[PDB]
Amino acid sequence: SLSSEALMRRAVSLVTDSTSTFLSQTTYALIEAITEYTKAVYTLTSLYRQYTSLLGKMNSEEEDEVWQVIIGARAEMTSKHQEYLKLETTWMTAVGLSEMAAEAAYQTGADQASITARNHIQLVKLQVEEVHQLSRKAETKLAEAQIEELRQKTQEEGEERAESEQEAYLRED
Template sequence: MAALGRGAAFLRLLRSNAQVLCRRCKPSWRSVAGMVSVTLGGTLCAVPFTQVPSLTHESLIKRAASLVTDSSSTFLSQSTLALIDAITEYSKAVQTLITLQKRYLASLGKLSQVEEDSIWQVMIGQRAELNDRQEDCKRFEAVWVTALRLCETAAEAAYTSGAEHASITMQTNIQLARSQAEEALKLSRGLDKTLLEVKALEVQASAQRAAALEKSEDDVPEAYLRED
């Protein structure tokens, strides 16, 4: 018990001395940190600080180049999709016209004049739709070519600025867009070729029919052609 009493008295003495020292001198940051460390049992809590990245000209240019390649890729993908859709609709119109022309050729000489005129009206309407679809293809192809050139420039700029990954990604997107558009254009060219072949057959059949009609008129006896 006596030892405990002496210990308590010693602590009170230390506390009173510390209060006197605090009144006489203004504590510095180091002394406050020391007192805090004593209060926390001799340990300091680590406070995390966010490391601010270095914003150099090179890093800012690389970020800008990456943003350009991203936006250019979006432009290219949208224009490629629009071009492919336009080519698909054009191909459908060509296939419909080919079917109509083949049916017309197969029915030559078997239909009345009224029926032939009806088929011709349908074919004329289909040709008008074909022209509209062809204009859509030309318009979207012009946009697609512009997007392609923009992406090529963006890929070159990214490579020059040091953004190699963005440049490689951009070149991959360009190759993919080229292959997709070329596949659709290849199908369209094949249908155009078939349409020209059918058109040639139609012209040939019409010429043969006109010649046959002219010959039949020449074979009519002269007596039937005289007026009474």
């Protein structure tokens, strides 16, 4: 049936291009929430530097207020993380739809549509992995700032602990 297969091929090209546009919008929403997450990550990084600059016993209206802002930043980062994770779950569902569409394109013989699908899938996945690399970069620098904050915090802690042992030794011993 010439008309039947021709139209069915054309329809699978429509499914392919719709699923491509959808997956693009999904990648864009995912990238948006990943970007907001990244922003929050860099914010938390700077806030860790701040808190590290405020380590040792000093104005709690500075130290613990910076800590409170750090809590706010953490909440922002975590909520956006959860939302971009929902987006990414839907994004993987979208990838799955695009792949199933490419297989439909083969079964009908719209191999040109199947190829264009595969191309778009690859471009999207590449850019997504790229923004994932940006996310990992931000997260690695956040981890670095966490490590700096740990070094400083622990330093102060151990110093104070030693001094407290000596001050306890000043008495009754």
